[PDB]
Every structure is written in C-alpha cells, then in structure tokens.
C-alpha cells in the first residue's frame, strides 16, 4: 500500500542573479529591490516559492519507500517505533560508530524494522 507521492514542482528555487556572480549563493532570498525583474513577476522570470507549491498533506515528509523517517542513535531508540514498523523507518545517525551500527542493524531485523542505512560504514 502506497499513495502516489505527487510533486507540484521537482526543481530547486535558486536565488535570483546566482547564475552570474559567485558571492550570491544558490539559497533562496526573495528580492526586495524596487526594479527587480523577479519580484514584479515579469514574464519569463516569474519563479518564486508560493505556498500553493506545497505538496499533499497525506504524503508530506514521506520517503519514496512509503515510510516516514525516524532517526535512531542506539538500539534502545529502535523500540520507540517497534509498534509502527509499517509507518516509520529507522535511519542510524551519521555519528554512530561502525560497531554500534551492527547492533542496531541486527536488532532492526529482530523487530522487523526497515533501515535506510543498512550499507553504511561497512568494511
């Protein structure tokens, strides 16, 4: 069972005038200038993030697997979603060592919990 995750825009909302200059980063900042080509929404360049682009509520923050993300740091965090293994999927944090990962990965098999980092920090 998986509802079709529908996206109203699959691109990135890059900052205006970030394709010419390097001091202007590619993170969105709405232009406040009076003569700006974009805040007036001129034709051809009228791409701004407006709340209408927001994706469906039912399938918001849902990974393509159909399961939401739940980060775990130790084996005892897995028990927090052992009842909801059909809704949440464990994702071992990036600081957990390569020894504690084999404890979490093996325990996630016992409780039958999908793990998104099953091939991370392998030998």
């Amino acid at each position: 069972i998986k509802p079709k995750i529908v996206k109203k825009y699959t691109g990135h909302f890059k900052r205006f005038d970030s394709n010419r200059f390097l001091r202007v980063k590619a993170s969105w900042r709405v232009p406040r200038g009076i003569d700006n080509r974009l805040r007036r929404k001129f034709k051809g360049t009228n791409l701004l993030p407006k709340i209408g682009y927001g994706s469906a509520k039912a399938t918001r923050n849902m990974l393509p697997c159909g399961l939401y993300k739940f980060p775990v740091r130790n084996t005892t965090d897995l028990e927090m979603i052992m009842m909801q293994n059909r809704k949440y999927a464990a994702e071992i944090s990036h600081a957990v060592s390569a020894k504690k990962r084999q404890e979490i990965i093996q325990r996630a098999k016992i409780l039958n919990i999908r793990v998104l980092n099953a091939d991370a920090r392998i030998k």
């Binding site: 009842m83 909801q84 293994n85 404890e103 093996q106 098999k109 016992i110 039958n112």
Partner: protein, 203 residues
C-alpha cells in the same frame, strides 16, 4: 498473546532483549503478498457479465480486414464471439490466408460486406478451453532455467491439437472458391493505394 503488530522472527546466535521470546518457541510465518481473489470459473455455456456488445456490422460468416497486431492487413472470416472474453473467434482459413484460428478484439477489425455465409461450420470445440490449451505459457519464476528450448518444445507438443481443430476450415474453403475473384481477394494483403482516403472508403 502476541499483539496484532508483532511478528516474531528467529535470531542467529545474536544478542536479544530480555522481553523478546527466544528461538525455541518461535515459528516462522510465510510472507503473504497476494490478497485479491482470482476469477471464478463458471459453466462453458453461460456468457460472462463482462461481454462486449458487437457492432451491428459484424455478423457470423463475414470477412473482416484486420488493421492491427501481428496479422495486419490480412482478411479473415468471423465464426462467432468468444463469450468468456468477448474477443472474436476468427479464422483466416489457413489453406488460403495462412492466418490460424485465434482470438482478436473487436476494435482491431473492419467488417467488409463480403459475407461468406457458411452455416454448418461445426465449431463444437474452439471454446475458451481450446484457446487456453494452446497458448504458449512462460517458464514461471522458480522452474529451474530451461532457457530457449522450453518454448521450442512448447510449440511442438501443441501442434497436434491445432491441426485437429482445422476441421473448422475444411468446409469454409469450399465456398471461398465459389465466388469468382474471392480466393485472390482473400489471399492477398490489404493496402491503401494512392487516392484511397480512409474517410472516403466504404466496405
């Protein structure tokens, strides 16, 4: 007992919590993926609820040009409609066309006015049982490999039943030769020569 959300699994000599049931009291369950029930099989003489409504231009014994599929442009003779599926049971008599006895959907054919008529065709067989018996099935998923020769040996074992069911076509060829120029018209293909526009052609 076990909650509805719990499915115990075995552990391969690894650390387990204090509350997890051990392996000696755990039985494995087979993962189940198929839930929808299949198609109920009913009598061979009752038409399905899901039956196409034939066009008024299609009557048994007509000659249908086929405009799509493997046999594109060939002219066939329509015997009767397969009730269990709604697809037409046509036969482009193999002694003339080379078109075997098959099923085809009613939207891939064009009904010409040349009605071969022919009663007493003796279609006592050629129900849905025959068509499912000669269809070349696949090799499934676990049946070893059997690459290539499985389908080659499939066709050879189905050759006899196909030939036996050619008693349908012995009678029809008799009245194909009756009408002059009807053997030549059937044997050849169908082509749209220069100057024949589809919206103007009438059959």
């Amino acid at each position: 007992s076990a909650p509805q959300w719990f499915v115990p699994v075995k552990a391969g000599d690894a650390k387990v919590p204090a509350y997890y049931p051990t392996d000696d009291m755990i039985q494995e369950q087979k993962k189940k993926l198929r839930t929808r029930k299949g198609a109920k099989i009913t009598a061979l003489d009752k038409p399905a609820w899901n039956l196409e409504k034939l066009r008024k231009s299609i009557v048994p014994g007509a000659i249908l040009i086929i405009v799509a599929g493997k046999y594109a442009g060939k002219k066939v003779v329509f015997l009767k409609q397969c009730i269990k599926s709604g697809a037409l049971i046509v036969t482009g008599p193999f002694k003339i066309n080379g078109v075997p006895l098959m099923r085809i959907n009613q939207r891939y054919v064009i009904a010409t006015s040349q009605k071969v008529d022919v009663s007493k065709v003796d279609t006592t067989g050629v129900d849905v049982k025959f068509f499912k018996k000669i269809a070349i099935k696949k090799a499934a998923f676990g049946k070893t490999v059997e690459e290539d020769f499985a389908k080659k040996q499939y066709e050879a074992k189905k050759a006899l039943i196909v030939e036996k069911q050619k008693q349908v076509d012995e009678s029809i060829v008799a009245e194909i030769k009756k009408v002059p120029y009807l053997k030549e018209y059937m044997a050849s293909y169908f082509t749209l020569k220069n100057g024949d526009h589809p919206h103007l052609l009438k059959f």
